Coordinates of all heavy atoms in Angstrom, one line a residue:
Chain C
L24 N 63.1 -46.4 60.5 CA 62.3 -46.4 61.7 C 63.2 -46.0 63.0 O 62.9 -45.0 63.6 CB 61.8 -47.8 62.0 CG 60.3 -48.0 61.6 CD1 60.0 -49.4 62.0 CD2 59.5 -47.0 62.1
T25 N 64.4 -46.6 63.2 CA 65.3 -46.3 64.3 C 66.7 -46.0 63.8 O 67.5 -45.3 64.5 CB 65.4 -47.4 65.3 OG1 65.5 -48.7 64.6 CG2 64.1 -47.5 66.1
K26 N 67.1 -46.5 62.7 CA 68.4 -46.1 62.1 C 68.1 -45.3 60.8 O 67.2 -45.5 59.9 CB 69.2 -47.3 61.7 CG 69.9 -48.0 62.8 CD 71.0 -49.0 62.3 CE 71.9 -49.3 63.4 NZ 71.5 -50.4 64.4
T27 N 68.9 -44.3 60.6 CA 69.0 -43.5 59.3 C 70.0 -44.1 58.4 O 70.8 -45.0 58.8 CB 69.4 -42.0 59.5 OG1 70.6 -42.0 60.1 CG2 68.3 -41.4 60.4
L28 N 70.2 -43.6 57.2 CA 71.3 -44.1 56.3 C 72.6 -43.8 57.0 O 73.5 -44.6 56.9 CB 71.1 -43.3 55.0 CG 72.2 -43.8 53.9 CD1 72.2 -45.4 53.8 CD2 72.1 -43.1 52.5
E29 N 72.7 -42.6 57.6 CA 74.1 -42.3 58.3 C 74.3 -43.3 59.5 O 75.5 -43.7 59.7 CB 74.1 -40.9 58.8 CG 75.4 -40.6 59.5 CD 75.7 -39.1 59.6 OE1 74.7 -38.3 59.2 OE2 76.8 -38.7 60.0
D30 N 73.2 -43.5 60.3 CA 73.3 -44.5 61.4 C 74.0 -45.8 60.8 O 74.9 -46.3 61.4 CB 72.0 -44.7 62.2 CG 71.6 -43.6 62.9 OD1 72.5 -42.8 63.4 OD2 70.3 -43.3 63.1
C31 N 73.5 -46.2 59.8 CA 74.0 -47.5 59.1 C 75.4 -47.4 58.7 O 76.2 -48.3 58.9 CB 73.2 -47.9 57.9 SG 71.4 -48.4 58.2
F32 N 75.8 -46.2 58.2 CA 77.3 -46.1 57.8 C 78.1 -46.1 59.1 O 79.1 -46.9 59.1 CB 77.4 -44.7 57.2 CG 77.2 -44.7 55.6 CD1 75.9 -45.3 55.1 CD2 78.2 -44.4 54.8 CE1 75.7 -45.3 53.7 CE2 78.0 -44.5 53.3 CZ 76.7 -44.9 52.8
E33 N 77.8 -45.4 60.2 CA 78.5 -45.4 61.4 C 78.5 -46.8 62.0 O 79.5 -47.2 62.6 CB 78.0 -44.3 62.4 CG 79.1 -44.1 63.5 CD 78.7 -42.9 64.4 OE1 77.7 -42.2 64.1 OE2 79.4 -42.8 65.4
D34 N 77.4 -47.5 61.8 CA 77.3 -48.8 62.4 C 78.4 -49.8 61.7 O 79.1 -50.5 62.3 CB 75.9 -49.4 62.2 CG 75.5 -50.4 63.4 OD1 75.3 -49.9 64.5 OD2 75.5 -51.6 63.1
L35 N 78.5 -49.6 60.3 CA 79.6 -50.4 59.6 C 80.9 -49.9 60.0 O 81.9 -50.7 60.1 CB 79.5 -50.1 58.1 CG 78.7 -51.3 57.3 CD1 77.2 -51.3 57.9 CD2 78.6 -51.0 55.8
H36 N 81.0 -48.6 60.5 CA 82.4 -48.0 60.8 C 82.8 -48.6 62.2 O 83.9 -49.1 62.3 CB 82.2 -46.5 60.9 CG 83.6 -45.9 61.0 ND1 84.0 -45.2 62.1 CD2 84.6 -45.8 60.1 CE1 85.2 -44.6 61.9 NE2 85.6 -45.1 60.7
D37 N 81.9 -48.7 63.1 CA 82.2 -49.4 64.4 C 82.8 -50.8 64.2 O 83.8 -51.1 64.9 CB 80.9 -49.5 65.3 CG 80.5 -48.3 66.0 OD1 81.3 -47.2 65.9 OD2 79.5 -48.1 66.5
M38 N 82.2 -51.5 63.2 CA 82.8 -52.9 62.8 C 84.1 -52.8 62.2 O 84.8 -53.9 62.1 CB 81.7 -53.5 62.0 CG 80.5 -53.9 62.7 SD 79.2 -54.5 61.5 CE 77.8 -53.4 62.0
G39 N 84.5 -51.6 61.7 CA 85.7 -51.7 60.8 C 85.3 -52.1 59.3 O 86.2 -52.2 58.6
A40 N 84.1 -52.4 59.1 CA 83.8 -52.8 57.7 C 83.8 -51.6 56.8 O 83.4 -50.5 57.1 CB 82.4 -53.3 57.8
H41 N 84.3 -51.9 55.6 CA 84.4 -50.8 54.5 C 83.5 -51.1 53.3 O 82.8 -50.1 52.9 CB 85.8 -50.8 54.0 CG 86.8 -50.4 55.0 ND1 86.9 -49.3 55.6 CD2 87.9 -51.1 55.6 CE1 87.8 -49.1 56.5 NE2 88.5 -50.4 56.6
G42 N 83.1 -52.3 53.0 CA 82.3 -52.5 51.8 C 80.9 -52.4 52.2 O 80.4 -52.8 53.3
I43 N 80.0 -52.0 51.3 CA 78.6 -51.8 51.5 C 77.8 -52.3 50.3 O 78.4 -52.4 49.1 CB 78.2 -50.4 51.9 CG1 76.8 -50.3 52.5 CG2 78.3 -49.5 50.6 CD1 76.5 -48.9 52.9
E44 N 76.7 -52.9 50.5 CA 75.6 -53.0 49.6 C 74.4 -52.4 49.9 O 73.9 -52.5 51.0 CB 75.3 -54.5 49.3 CG 74.5 -54.9 48.2 CD 73.5 -56.0 48.5 OE1 72.6 -55.8 49.4 OE2 73.5 -56.9 47.8
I45 N 73.8 -51.6 48.9 CA 72.6 -50.9 49.2 C 71.5 -51.5 48.2 O 71.9 -52.2 47.2 CB 72.6 -49.4 49.0 CG1 73.1 -49.1 47.6 CG2 73.7 -48.8 49.9 CD1 72.7 -47.8 47.1
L46 N 70.3 -51.2 48.4 CA 69.2 -51.6 47.5 C 68.7 -50.2 46.9 O 68.3 -49.4 47.6 CB 68.1 -52.3 48.3 CG 68.6 -53.6 49.0 CD1 67.4 -54.1 49.9 CD2 69.0 -54.6 48.0
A47 N 68.6 -50.3 45.5 CA 68.2 -49.1 44.7 C 66.8 -48.6 45.3 O 66.7 -47.5 45.6 CB 68.2 -49.5 43.2
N48 N 66.0 -49.4 45.4 CA 64.5 -49.1 45.8 C 64.3 -48.9 47.3 O 63.3 -48.8 47.8 CB 63.5 -50.2 45.3 CG 63.7 -50.5 43.8 OD1 64.8 -50.8 43.4 ND2 62.6 -50.3 43.0
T49 N 65.4 -48.8 48.0 CA 65.3 -48.5 49.4 C 66.2 -47.4 50.0 O 65.7 -46.7 50.7 CB 65.7 -49.8 50.4 OG1 65.1 -50.9 49.8 CG2 65.3 -49.6 51.8
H50 N 67.4 -47.3 49.5 CA 68.3 -46.4 50.1 C 68.7 -45.2 49.4 O 69.5 -44.3 49.9 CB 69.7 -47.2 50.5 CG 69.4 -48.5 51.4 ND1 69.7 -49.7 50.9 CD2 68.9 -48.6 52.6 CE1 69.3 -50.7 51.7 NE2 68.8 -49.9 52.7
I51 N 68.2 -45.0 48.1 CA 68.4 -43.8 47.5 C 67.2 -42.9 47.6 O 66.1 -43.3 47.0 CB 68.8 -44.1 45.9 CG1 70.0 -44.9 45.8 CG2 68.9 -42.8 45.2 CD1 69.9 -45.9 44.6
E52 N 67.3 -41.8 48.2 CA 66.3 -40.8 48.4 C 65.8 -40.3 47.0 O 66.6 -40.0 46.2 CB 66.7 -39.7 49.3 CG 66.0 -39.6 50.6 CD 66.9 -38.7 51.5 OE1 67.0 -37.5 51.3 OE2 67.4 -39.3 52.6
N53 N 64.4 -40.4 46.9 CA 63.8 -39.9 45.7 C 64.1 -40.8 44.6 O 64.1 -40.3 43.3 CB 64.1 -38.4 45.4 CG 63.0 -37.7 44.6 OD1 61.8 -37.6 45.2 ND2 63.1 -37.2 43.4
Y54 N 64.4 -42.0 44.8 CA 64.6 -43.0 43.8 C 63.3 -43.0 42.9 O 62.2 -43.0 43.3 CB 64.8 -44.4 44.3 CG 65.1 -45.5 43.3 CD1 66.4 -45.5 42.7 CD2 64.2 -46.4 42.9 CE1 66.7 -46.6 41.8 CE2 64.5 -47.4 42.0 CZ 65.8 -47.5 41.4 OH 66.1 -48.4 40.5
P55 N 63.5 -43.0 41.4 CA 64.8 -43.3 40.9 C 65.6 -42.0 40.4 O 66.7 -42.2 39.7 CB 64.4 -44.1 39.6 CG 63.0 -43.9 39.4 CD 62.3 -43.3 40.5
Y56 N 65.3 -40.8 40.9 CA 65.9 -39.6 40.4 C 66.3 -38.8 41.6 O 65.8 -37.8 42.0 CB 64.9 -38.8 39.5 CG 64.4 -39.7 38.4 CD1 63.1 -40.3 38.5 CD2 65.2 -40.0 37.3 CE1 62.7 -41.1 37.5 CE2 64.7 -40.8 36.3 CZ 63.5 -41.4 36.4 OH 62.9 -42.1 35.3
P57 N 67.6 -39.2 42.3 CA 68.1 -38.3 43.3 C 68.5 -37.0 42.9 O 68.8 -36.7 41.7 CB 69.2 -39.2 43.8 CG 69.6 -40.1 42.6 CD 68.3 -40.4 41.9
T58 N 68.6 -36.1 43.8 CA 69.1 -34.7 43.5 C 70.6 -34.7 43.6 O 71.3 -35.5 44.3 CB 68.6 -33.6 44.5 OG1 69.1 -33.9 45.9 CG2 67.1 -33.7 44.5
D59 N 71.2 -33.7 42.9 CA 72.7 -33.4 43.0 C 73.1 -33.2 44.5 O 74.2 -33.6 44.9 CB 73.0 -32.2 42.2 CG 72.9 -32.6 40.7 OD1 72.6 -33.7 40.4 OD2 73.3 -31.7 39.9
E60 N 72.1 -32.6 45.3 CA 72.4 -32.5 46.7 C 72.5 -33.8 47.4 O 73.5 -34.0 48.1 CB 71.3 -31.5 47.3 CG 71.5 -31.4 48.8 CD 70.5 -30.6 49.5 OE1 69.4 -30.2 48.9 OE2 70.7 -30.1 50.6
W61 N 71.5 -34.6 47.2 CA 71.5 -35.9 47.9 C 72.8 -36.7 47.4 O 73.5 -37.4 48.3 CB 70.3 -36.7 47.7 CG 70.3 -38.0 48.5 CD1 69.8 -38.1 49.8 CD2 70.8 -39.2 48.1 NE1 70.0 -39.4 50.2 CE2 70.7 -40.2 49.3 CE3 71.4 -39.7 46.9 CZ2 71.1 -41.5 49.2 CZ3 71.8 -41.1 47.0 CH2 71.7 -41.9 48.1
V62 N 73.2 -36.8 46.2 CA 74.3 -37.5 45.8 C 75.6 -37.1 46.4 O 76.5 -37.9 46.8 CB 74.4 -37.5 44.1 CG1 75.7 -38.1 43.7 CG2 73.2 -38.1 43.6

Side-chain angles (χ1 to χ4, degrees):
Chain C
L24 269 183
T25 48
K26 277 194 169 81
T27 65
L28 184 56
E29 178 162 12
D30 289 332
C31 295
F32 275 58
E33 196 173 352
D34 214 74
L35 265 61
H36 197 243
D37 283 352
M38 286 168 233
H41 300 293
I43 197 177
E44 183 220 67
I45 65 158
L46 302 171
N48 309 54
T49 312
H50 305 118
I51 302 148
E52 244 160 68
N53 212 59
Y54 185 77
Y56 306 102
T58 69
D59 287 0
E60 173 178 23
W61 187 88
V62 170

